[PDB]
């Protein structure tokens, strides 16, 4: 009866920034609260609706996105921003409604030496559009002269490992990051609470 | 600078496996896929396969897809060759090369090559 | 695309006299897509030329190269008696990169 969520935050593999995971969780009872106070996150910025008095509200499709970024790009999670994760690799709406958790995963997402397992997208063509997946791997066009395929000159690869030391700042550390979209529409919701 | 400095000569049997590694050194691996290319005694170079180390994916030829398997260490930037059920005209000169991560790309730097015999 | 031949096969030329290598694509490289190499006997092929027209790093001008579609020909004037090698062909228009034969330049005595 019990919504899971311990494939979205106790999850032991997570995805890219680039190849973020969309689960679609619906019929079931999601208690919000147990999050709040467990005091094992560092961010719970909820956009639309609050912190509080999301069990008393019923849902109809609500998703999670998880991903891992680093420190100094948390800040770009959020409804109308920009840089680039929030440009090439995962964009929010400007009337996203939901809650976005993140929370410190250095003690786990890396590997002594140099973790190269997670990735991100460093220039595209175009901007991303919200709540779209570009898991493209061909060679970003730049400068003048085509480049047809060789990486070259003026052709860069657009994947970019992150690097995760252990022995890093505050800002170069893993931050695994889950994005809630509380849908909400006149139609019979299904996901309620408690 | 970039040296793939490779192991040396292996007497194998035949029908079995062999293990070569290739030392890459100088700038980073991650930033550079490699391709094993082989020279038979007389004959010209046949591309085996390319491995990916960001991506962690391997492509191979029609004549190796599912022969050949190789992997890529990214902690001690080494990669490996892996070639199963060995015949006899497998005996040839195992270069080490360091392509660039795309679609098209040629095999600038080379490594030592290993004169690994299977008609023991 | 898939198969390349060299014309000289064993190009027996005089020590300073300028060679020309021949290697004639088979499916119209669309993109001038072809590399040179010069592989020392015991030894690691020598990349020279990308895209058969820009040499490589450190590589003299006494190399050059040519051909747009279907022809590439290499260009070694005032050959030095080191550059006695073999010289294979590599193109990479196509998925699969294939190899050529080889012209063993031989010296004339």
């Known amino acids: 009866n019990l919504c899971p969520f311990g494939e979205v935050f106790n999850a032991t593999r997570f995805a890219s920034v680039y190849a973020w995971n969309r689960k679609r969780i619906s019929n079931c009872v999601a208690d919000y609260s147990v999050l709040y106070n467990s005091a094992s996150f560092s961010t719970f910025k909820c956009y639309g609706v609050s912190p509080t008095k999301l069990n008393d509200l019923c849902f109809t499709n609500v998703y999670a996105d998880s991903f891992v970024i680093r420190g100094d790009e948390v800040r770009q999670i959020a409804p109308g921003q920009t840089g680039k994760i929030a440009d090439y690799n995962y964009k929010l709406p400007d009337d996203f409604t939901g809650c976005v958790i993140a929370w410190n995963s250095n003690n786990l997402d890396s590997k002594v030496g140099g973790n190269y397992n997670y990735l991100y997208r460093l220039f595209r063509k175009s901007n991303l559009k919200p709540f779209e997946r570009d898991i493209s791997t061909e060679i970003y066009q730049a400068g003048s002269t085509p480049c047809n395929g060789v990486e070259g000159f003026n052709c860069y690869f657009p994947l970019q490992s992150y690097g995760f030391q252990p022995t890093n700042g505050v800002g170069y550390q893993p931050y695994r990051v889950v994005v809630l979209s509380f849908e909400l529409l006149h139609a019979p919701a299904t996901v309620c609470g408690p | 600078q970039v040296q793939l400095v490779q192991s040396g000569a292996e007497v194998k049997r035949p029908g079995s496996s062999v293990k070569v590694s290739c030392k890459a050194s100088?700038?980073?691996?991650?930033?550079?896929?490699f391709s094993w290319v082989r020279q038979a005694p007389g004959q010209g170079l046949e591309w085996m396969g390319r491995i990916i180390p960001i991506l962690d994916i391997a492509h191979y030829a029609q004549k190796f897809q599912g022969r050949l398997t190789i992997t890529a260490d990214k902690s001690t930037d080494t990669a490996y060759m892996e070639l199963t059920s060995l015949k006899s005209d497998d005996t040839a000169v195992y270069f080490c090369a360091r392509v660039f991560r795309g679609s098209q790309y040629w095999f600038d730097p080379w490594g030592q090559g290993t004169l690994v015999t299977v008609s023991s | 695309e898939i198969v390349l031949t060299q014309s000289p096969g064993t190009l027996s030329l005089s020590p300073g006299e300028r060679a020309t290598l021949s290697c004639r694509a088979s499916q119209s490289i669309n993109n001038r897509h072809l590399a040179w190499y010069q592989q020392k006997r015991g030894q690691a092929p020598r990349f020279l030329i990308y895209?058969?027209?820009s040499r490589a790093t450190g590589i003299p001008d006494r190399f050059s190269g040519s051909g747009s579609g279907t022809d590439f020909t290499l260009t070694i004037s005032r050959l030095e008696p080191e550059d006695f090698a073999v010289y294979y062909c590599?193109?990479?228009?196509?998925?699969?990169?294939?190899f050529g034969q080889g012209t063993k330049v031989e010296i004339k005595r």
């Open positions: 590599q193109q990479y228009g196509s998925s699969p990169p294939t």
């Open positions: 895209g058969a027209a």
């Open positions: 100088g700038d980073t691996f991650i930033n550079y896929a």
